[PDB]
Design an enzyme around this catalytic site. Structure first.
Site, PDB file in Angstrom:
ATOM      1  N   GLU A   1      33.304  42.715 -13.911  1.00  0.00           N
ATOM      2  CA  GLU A   1      32.284  41.777 -14.363  1.00  0.00           C
ATOM      3  C   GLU A   1      32.875  40.405 -14.640  1.00  0.00           C
ATOM      4  O   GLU A   1      32.128  39.431 -14.767  1.00  0.00           O
ATOM      5  CB  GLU A   1      31.579  42.335 -15.600  1.00  0.00           C
TER       6      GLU A   1
ATOM      7  N   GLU B   1      28.019  50.781 -24.875  1.00  0.00           N
ATOM      8  CA  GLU B   1      26.909  50.453 -24.018  1.00  0.00           C
ATOM      9  C   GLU B   1      25.567  51.001 -24.461  1.00  0.00           C
ATOM     10  O   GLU B   1      24.533  50.398 -24.136  1.00  0.00           O
ATOM     11  CB  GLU B   1      27.217  50.830 -22.579  1.00  0.00           C
TER      12      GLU B   1
ATOM     13  N   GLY C   1      33.881  44.180 -18.549  1.00  0.00           N
ATOM     14  CA  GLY C   1      35.012  44.815 -17.901  1.00  0.00           C
ATOM     15  C   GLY C   1      35.489  43.970 -16.743  1.00  0.00           C
ATOM     16  O   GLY C   1      34.965  42.922 -16.442  1.00  0.00           O
ATOM     17  N   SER C   2      36.512  44.443 -16.044  1.00  0.00           N
ATOM     18  CA  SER C   2      37.147  43.607 -15.032  1.00  0.00           C
ATOM     19  C   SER C   2      36.267  43.371 -13.828  1.00  0.00           C
ATOM     20  O   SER C   2      36.348  42.293 -13.224  1.00  0.00           O
ATOM     21  CB  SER C   2      38.520  44.108 -14.660  1.00  0.00           C
TER      22      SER C   2
ATOM     23  N   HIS D   1      29.855  47.690 -17.387  1.00  0.00           N
ATOM     24  CA  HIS D   1      31.039  47.914 -16.581  1.00  0.00           C
ATOM     25  C   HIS D   1      30.960  49.195 -15.755  1.00  0.00           C
ATOM     26  O   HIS D   1      31.130  50.290 -16.276  1.00  0.00           O
ATOM     27  CB  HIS D   1      32.283  47.980 -17.463  1.00  0.00           C
TER      28      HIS D   1
ATOM     29  N   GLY E   1      12.376  59.973 -27.752  1.00  0.00           N
ATOM     30  CA  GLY E   1      12.955  60.781 -28.806  1.00  0.00           C
ATOM     31  C   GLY E   1      14.461  60.729 -28.856  1.00  0.00           C
ATOM     32  O   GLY E   1      15.066  61.496 -29.642  1.00  0.00           O
TER      33      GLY E   1
HETATM   34  C1  LIG Z   1      20.711  61.653 -28.407  1.00  0.00           C
HETATM   35  C2  LIG Z   1      20.043  62.754 -29.174  1.00  0.00           C
HETATM   36  N1  LIG Z   1      20.765  63.834 -29.558  1.00  0.00           N
HETATM   37  C3  LIG Z   1      20.199  64.810 -30.285  1.00  0.00           C
HETATM   38  C4  LIG Z   1      18.876  64.760 -30.564  1.00  0.00           C
HETATM   39  C5  LIG Z   1      18.215  65.856 -31.369  1.00  0.00           C
HETATM   40  N2  LIG Z   1      17.690  65.441 -32.646  1.00  0.00           N
HETATM   41  C6  LIG Z   1      16.299  65.249 -32.986  1.00  0.00           C
HETATM   42  S1  LIG Z   1      16.024  64.901 -34.546  1.00  0.00           S
HETATM   43  C7  LIG Z   1      17.563  65.162 -34.987  1.00  0.00           C
HETATM   44  C8  LIG Z   1      18.060  65.089 -36.441  1.00  0.00           C
HETATM   45  C9  LIG Z   1      18.157  63.675 -36.933  1.00  0.00           C
HETATM   46  O1  LIG Z   1      18.549  63.748 -38.306  1.00  0.00           O
HETATM   47  P1  LIG Z   1      18.317  62.516 -39.262  1.00  0.00           P
HETATM   48  O2  LIG Z   1      18.418  61.224 -38.529  1.00  0.00           O
HETATM   49  O3  LIG Z   1      19.275  62.668 -40.402  1.00  0.00           O
HETATM   50  O4  LIG Z   1      16.823  62.646 -39.785  1.00  0.00           O
HETATM   51  P2  LIG Z   1      16.078  63.850 -40.581  1.00  0.00           P
HETATM   52  O5  LIG Z   1      15.628  64.851 -39.553  1.00  0.00           O
HETATM   53  O6  LIG Z   1      17.077  64.393 -41.565  1.00  0.00           O
HETATM   54  O7  LIG Z   1      14.918  63.122 -41.246  1.00  0.00           O
HETATM   55  C10 LIG Z   1      18.453  65.471 -33.902  1.00  0.00           C
HETATM   56  C11 LIG Z   1      19.910  65.699 -33.868  1.00  0.00           C
HETATM   57  C12 LIG Z   1      18.167  63.691 -30.058  1.00  0.00           C
HETATM   58  N3  LIG Z   1      16.803  63.581 -30.222  1.00  0.00           N
HETATM   59  N4  LIG Z   1      18.729  62.676 -29.404  1.00  0.00           N
HETATM   60  C1  LIG Z   2      32.964  52.312 -21.256  1.00  0.00           C
HETATM   61  C2  LIG Z   2      33.780  51.116 -20.864  1.00  0.00           C
HETATM   62  N1  LIG Z   2      33.310  49.873 -21.128  1.00  0.00           N
HETATM   63  C3  LIG Z   2      34.043  48.790 -20.827  1.00  0.00           C
HETATM   64  C4  LIG Z   2      35.221  48.934 -20.176  1.00  0.00           C
HETATM   65  C5  LIG Z   2      36.056  47.726 -19.815  1.00  0.00           C
HETATM   66  N2  LIG Z   2      37.337  47.652 -20.471  1.00  0.00           N
HETATM   67  C6  LIG Z   2      38.628  47.909 -19.875  1.00  0.00           C
HETATM   68  S1  LIG Z   2      39.893  47.619 -20.847  1.00  0.00           S
HETATM   69  C7  LIG Z   2      38.983  46.953 -22.012  1.00  0.00           C
HETATM   70  C8  LIG Z   2      39.558  46.334 -23.298  1.00  0.00           C
HETATM   71  C9  LIG Z   2      40.030  47.380 -24.264  1.00  0.00           C
HETATM   72  O1  LIG Z   2      40.609  46.681 -25.370  1.00  0.00           O
HETATM   73  P1  LIG Z   2      41.597  47.426 -26.347  1.00  0.00           P
HETATM   74  O2  LIG Z   2      41.260  48.870 -26.476  1.00  0.00           O
HETATM   75  O3  LIG Z   2      41.588  46.662 -27.634  1.00  0.00           O
HETATM   76  O4  LIG Z   2      43.030  47.335 -25.669  1.00  0.00           O
HETATM   77  P2  LIG Z   2      43.904  46.048 -25.203  1.00  0.00           P
HETATM   78  O5  LIG Z   2      43.418  45.651 -23.837  1.00  0.00           O
HETATM   79  O6  LIG Z   2      43.702  44.992 -26.253  1.00  0.00           O
HETATM   80  O7  LIG Z   2      45.319  46.612 -25.187  1.00  0.00           O
HETATM   81  C10 LIG Z   2      37.569  46.981 -21.758  1.00  0.00           C
HETATM   82  C11 LIG Z   2      36.420  46.555 -22.579  1.00  0.00           C
HETATM   83  C12 LIG Z   2      35.600  50.216 -19.838  1.00  0.00           C
HETATM   84  N3  LIG Z   2      36.744  50.467 -19.112  1.00  0.00           N
HETATM   85  N4  LIG Z   2      34.923  51.304 -20.199  1.00  0.00           N
END
Ligand SMILES: Cc1ncc(C[n+]2csc(CCOP(=O)(O)OP(=O)(O)O)c2C)c(N)n1
Ligand SMILES: Cc1ncc(C[n+]2csc(CCOP(=O)(O)OP(=O)(O)O)c2C)c(N)n1
Ligand SMILES: Cc1ncc(C[n+]2csc(CCOP(=O)(O)OP(=O)(O)O)c2C)c(N)n1
Ligand SMILES: [Ca+2]
Ligand SMILES: [Ca+2]
Ligand SMILES: [Ca+2]
Ligand SMILES: [Ca+2]
Ligand SMILES: [Ca+2]
Ligand SMILES: [Ca+2]
Ligand SMILES: [Ca+2]
Ligand SMILES: [Ca+2]
Ligand SMILES: [Ca+2]
Ligand SMILES: [Mg+2]
Ligand SMILES: [Mg+2]
Ligand SMILES: [Mg+2]
Ligand SMILES: [Mg+2]
Ligand SMILES: [Mg+2]
Ligand SMILES: [Mg+2]
Ligand SMILES: [Mg+2]
Ligand SMILES: [Mg+2]
Lengths: 524, 524, 524
Positions: free
Chosen positions: B27, B46, B24-25, B69, B400
């Site tokens: 950086e 990210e 980002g800018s 960023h 997890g």
């Molecule tokens: C970021 C995040 N969001 C939600 C959960 C809750 N979570 C634990 S297991 C699971 C299901 C994952 O399903 P899949 O990858 O299809 O595997 P399966 O259980 O079918 O073997 C979820 C949503 C988590 N652990 N982390």
């Molecule tokens: C979560 C996040 N990560 C990184 C950035 C940095 N960022 C600002 S604008 C930009 C580029 C976006 O590109 P695009 O959507 O293709 O539009 P364009 O600039 O080409 O019009 C980035 C990576 C941000 N603002 N937010």
């Protein structure tokens, strides 16, 4: 068993037998049925409670347990916690919380967002999510305070938890032994030893964690083997070395340029149990001169990370000092020559020079006295003039926060009943925790308090002069009668307006059966 | 020198040569003039950046450097940081801040109260108070991430700092060596060894810090000497032991009662490099049965403090494992008997049982393959069915948190170019960090991604069934075409609707020159 | 009643009927028995969950309720929370915690120090100390999110709390009405009105809180009465004014010097519902020129405190705008002249200029369309080329955090089923929350997604050029097939490689029954 019963059993099984406290209503359910084998030490304000506990922990080399009242009591103690953090003091700070049913409405006495209150000055801070968790949380607190690097911790407990049933499986907590008594692996330790053996002109710098570990004697052996001069790291909270040993070179000045100049020509500098370095004054320059390598042994990752120079090893100071002392070669270089005695400052029949006070203390005090310093303009002279042969002989507020020495001297004296404690405290500093005097009276803890009365915040006037800062307000503190304050809290009071009276008052104080305060008129 | 030049020199001198980032800018002033000897690895979101870096750090056993960023980029990565905290991953997370002159007005892109943002998931978090402090702060970050217990750290840098003059005395940072390679003192180590030698029926439990330390072989020697069964601690993020060694007993169930029952009759249980314990399901009972003593070796004070039972020693896992393996006696007891091969699940010509998939992978994959698991309903079978002979062969999201394995598999493959990485990921889990696929395509990192497609969040349906929880929404994820997603990000895509097709697709994938995704139709 | 039943009754009585979520095991006890009158909207990753909820809340002008999984799910959403903080979005974020009995041991899925995790991006963050407190804590969350200045809040709930008995006195929570619909006292309001009436050349600047309050029409009346030009405050997250009204002057450039120059000669500048100001680029100069007085009306004390100039009034934007519009005199000055139409950029038969895209959208879209912008290099042209007559017609990530528009467009479309939503998103930005597309498919939410594909992070290349920053890595994103990604998640996909195809694809999309993605080849 109740949470109350289980928690006190845990404390006793983990070696805790004293509660330093100032009570309130959220704590009454914890303090009721207080065990007959425990002692409660009351102090009248929480900076005093924590300072007393801190001195006790530092001198006893074991954790101390504190009980305070909610947010306001915790808050009153936070300056004391600032010092405790810097001294790595193992303090278990507990505070009572409102009953769980009244926390949401924020009833009076609710400690809001309690665990955040003492941050960033604690190693761990927590409020348990249920009553049955309390003993486990207490176990965590004990061990977190006690593991290297030691430090204060905080636990908030809703008052209704104590009477609830404990988990029977909390018995597994009682006898847990947790060790951080570790040292560098053999291969890398052999590399370090070879570097020390090969040094042509080594120096050693020692910090407070040496005295905390009782590594002092091992450091003497190490210095003798290496034939190395020994300095105490700047801003010293403790004394890690006998101050009349031939290798001793005194307190390092707390400046970047001053330290690199002092170390110039030393090819290897071994720092043990200190930050690198607790500088103070602005004194820009080189961290080290060319030709000096620094190696630090520290118990604290945060110290190792922030050093601006040198290698570091993060390990227990006691284990490392013992290993190094026993592994290094006996150098055939000549042992360093002892520092000469300091000069006698000319003293007329009037107000006392601080140098006169320290010389007189050194003459009259027992050889196993313990000194505390909160006489901020006189530290360098104190360090030159007191022969401190033994470990645990010196304490100074580790974060520079005033209000430490007066209460801490009481806690040190409680920890070391056979060693006469003498706190040398400026007239300015004496006020911060003045009510601590009452605890010494009440429990008959025979600390001697020497108040250096020059009428001003002297080191601030000095610094203002150096800075060429004119028209600074608030630097004078006239009109305080310390003998009347001592009478106020039931402590015997003496005065010393000249040297003859100083000697007379010290003689009386040293033979007294209780605490004594001596108000000394010092040069302004 | 500029802060920019000094900081890149510090990074290079401390062994860093790769930046994982999404720019980002704030950086751009850091990333300009990017050194020719560094590599930048772009990922499109990210969580993906941090997951890739995490896999790289875990497999390489060295710190990884990340650049994100401001607040929004840091925020997008916080789920990934949750895993990194639990795996003790040494990640240096940097984020760009607004120019100092615009921070007060909270211009767009200002990271407000930046150091608090990633707390409590980092070991250290900081924004420097001046430009010339930046290299020192970076040094602190490197060492804080790298010292035991390793973990993620965070540094926020105002973008205008990079072009400012550095302190010339920052050169002392470049070659600092900081060690935490420590082990228990000899006296207490001898006590531990005697307790292990005297045990009648010892057991060993190993956690992820063993694999992180590459202590696996030392633990094999230890288990052979003690003639002891070896379990992997529950919720395992890594594999610390060869899974077909005769002593191996598999993954412990993550329940209190289940573990104490498993350990019943073992008089001494030695836990190395694990929390005690990372339980998961509610399974109340005894922490240990009568007659079992537990001793834990952990690199993390927080683990030692919170264990509800047992003694603990806080030390480096590599140093301790090596010392113990070389000090214990050879027991004359009989070596444990290897676990038998698991059963073959009946498999028709339709959708794949997960057991069939793992058996087929075990047959076809190279013996030095590295597996990642984010197929949450199939973990027990995976652990039974893959013969993992070597260190660094298994990773599973340590907190997890889903979205780890897909990007981490790319970072592991980058770290270990000669070892084929195979990530086995559920259809639900695959979506969290799906855009990471692009990085594998762009840099031609030849990870194989096996998507287990059963149309549902299967383990949640299972748990809802156990809980007797009816009418739960949101558990099905129909209508995702993973071959089209792979095409979207430029990764070769295959399908496997039955066993013949699975074998064919795996054969094609194993011989491919680039990353490959295989969508496997698994039983629902 | 259970905590579960009481909490859902509270939610319903407070107008909540939808849960935006991604489930996990700590949430199953909350989600079981899900009420038949509630809707659950699943998204596949938590940035998507929160973005959808955010768009829904912003467009509906009412709080939205979110349920996430512990620390990892909360963490995945923190970038989305960064935007929500800046847009004052009233979001109630709940996350499931481990059962209270397993929190101390830090079982898998424990959210450690949970309330600190989302700080500093929430107005209030809390974990209740008991199960019976949960409904009260939920009440606090609802009101904290909803009171001016609105914003996100966080509540962590141990999963075992739901089945416990509620306090019967929680019924008093159900119908609480809490108002912050306040305006300046009459005496001081009359002073303000007189200052506006007496101004010789007033200007008005409007921010997003005007559109949030639906104060747009009152601001039109105010501008007409004062005969004042109207600008939108920089970095605009919403559109507060009809963009072809004669007073409208467009988007202010986000620079200090640029804004003071624009305001030069205006004697009184009235800012309503904006920070003063959300600058972005470094553009040093005067905050205001001599002769300009600024008066800000803001709903947010933090905005009022940090403005570097001007007076401020902290009050509800709707109440203030209505009062001012109805109290000011009709000035006899001439009404400002409308801005002229923008130029038509020359367009050949190849890749599309962004200006061509916006002109074509403006021609073909319904007059009540709602636009979202995450095409970061084209914002100025978008603002010039779309005639947005109605409130609620524009959204842009309020903290600049990418990954907002794609999910938010789905939530806006859910909130406003009769208004066609068109999200214009860069190829770079599209990846951050790409999986949100699945929710549009699954629930048949007919958002149109226009992907501006130029192969690069264009605004970063532009800024690098201005900065003269050479050798910046990571600015190109070749090799993404957005039609395949759309197919991956079940969304109809079209392409537009030239103007004829753009018109054809838009015609098809506007008449479609479901969501549609159009990949537009734009000039690089
Ligand atoms: C970021 C995040 N969001 C939600 C959960 C809750 N979570 C634990 S297991 C699971 C299901 C994952 O399903 P899949 O990858 O299809 O595997 P399966 O259980 O079918 O073997 C979820 C949503 C988590 N652990 N982390
Ligand atoms: C979560 C996040 N990560 C990184 C950035 C940095 N960022 C600002 S604008 C930009 C580029 C976006 O590109 P695009 O959507 O293709 O539009 P364009 O600039 O080409 O019009 C980035 C990576 C941000 N603002 N937010
Ligand atoms: C709690 C606290 N408040 C204020 C200070 C600042 N402080 C440093 S030294 C000093 C003066 C102390 O005066 P005194 O104890 O009389 O000793 P002198 O300097 O006169 O020797 C003060 C106020 C501090 N360190 N700690
Ligand atoms: Ca003498
Ligand atoms: Ca004692
Ligand atoms: Ca004084
Ligand atoms: Ca086989
Ligand atoms: Ca490698
Ligand atoms: Ca699945
Ligand atoms: Ca037109
Ligand atoms: Ca609606
Ligand atoms: Ca682009
Ligand atoms: Mg605090
Ligand atoms: Mg208990
Ligand atoms: Mg060794
Ligand atoms: Mg945080
Ligand atoms: Mg520098
Ligand atoms: Mg030893
Ligand atoms: Mg209730
Ligand atoms: Mg009024």
């Amino acid at each position: 068993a109740s949470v109350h019963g289980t928690t006190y059993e845990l404390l006793r099984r983990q070696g805790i037998d004293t509660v330093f406290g100032n009570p309130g209503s959220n704590e009454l359910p914890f303090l009721k049925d207080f065990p007959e084998d425990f002692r409660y030490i009351l102090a009248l304000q929480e900076a005093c409670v924590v300072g007393i506990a801190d001195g006790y922990a530092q001198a006893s080399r074991k954790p101390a347990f504190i009980n305070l009242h909610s947010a306001a009591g915790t808050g009153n103690a936070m300056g004391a916690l600032s010092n405790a953090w810097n001294s790595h003091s193992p303090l278990i700070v507990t505070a009572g919380q409102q009953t769980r049913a009244m926390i949401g409405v924020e009833a009076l006495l609710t400690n809001v967002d309690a665990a955040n209150l003492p941050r960033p000055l604690v190693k761990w801070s927590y409020e348990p999510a249920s009553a049955a968790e309390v003993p486990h949380a207490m176990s965590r607190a004990i061990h977190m305070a006690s593991m290297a690097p030691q430090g204060p911790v905080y636990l908030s407990v809703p008052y209704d938890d104590w009477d609830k049933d404990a988990d029977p499986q909390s018995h597994h907590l009682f006898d847990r032994h947790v060790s951080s008594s570790v040292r560098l692996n053999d291969q890398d330790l052999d590399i370090l030893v070879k570097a020390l053996n090969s040094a042509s002109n080594p120096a050693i710098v020692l910090g407070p964690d040496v005295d905390a570990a009782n590594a002092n004697a091992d450091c003497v052996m190490l210095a003798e083997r290496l034939k190395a001069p020994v300095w105490v790291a700047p801003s010293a909270p403790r004394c890690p070395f006998p101050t009349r040993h031939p290798c001793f070179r005194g307190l390092m000045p707390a400046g970047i340029a001053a330290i690199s100049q002092l170390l110039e020509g030393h090819d290897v500098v071994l720092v043990i149990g200190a930050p690198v370095f607790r500088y103070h004054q602005y004194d820009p320059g080189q961290y080290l001169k060319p030709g000096t390598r620094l190696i630090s042994v520290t118990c604290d990752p945060l110290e190792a990370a922030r050093a601006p120079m040198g290698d570091a090893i993060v390990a227990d100071i006691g284990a490392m000092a013992s290993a190094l002392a026993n592994l290094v070669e006996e150098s055939s270089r000549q042992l360093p020559t002892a520092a000469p005695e300091p000069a006698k400052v000319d003293q007329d029949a009037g107000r006392l020079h601080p140098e006169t006070v320290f010389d007189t203390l050194n003459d009259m005090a027992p050889e196993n006295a313990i000194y505390l310093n909160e006489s901020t303009s006189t530290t360098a002279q104190m360090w030159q003039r007191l022969n401190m042969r033994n470990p645990g002989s010196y304490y100074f507020c580790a974060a520079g926060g005033l209000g430490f020495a007066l209460p801490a001297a009481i806690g040190v004296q409680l920890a070391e009943p056979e060693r006469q404690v003498i706190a040398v405290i400026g007239d300015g500093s004496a006020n911060y925790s003045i009510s601590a005097l009452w605890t010494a009276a009440q429990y008959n803890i025979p600390t001697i308090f020497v108040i250096m009365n020059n009428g001003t915040y002297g080191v601030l006037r000095w610094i203002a002069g150096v800075l060429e800062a004119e028209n600074v307000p608030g630097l004078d503190v006239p009109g305080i009668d310390f003998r009347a304050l001592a009478k106020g809290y039931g402590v015997q009071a003496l005065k010393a307006d000249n040297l003859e009276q100083l000697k007379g008052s010290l003689q009386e104080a040293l033979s007294a059966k209780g605490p004594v305060l001596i108000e000394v008129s010092t040069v302004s």
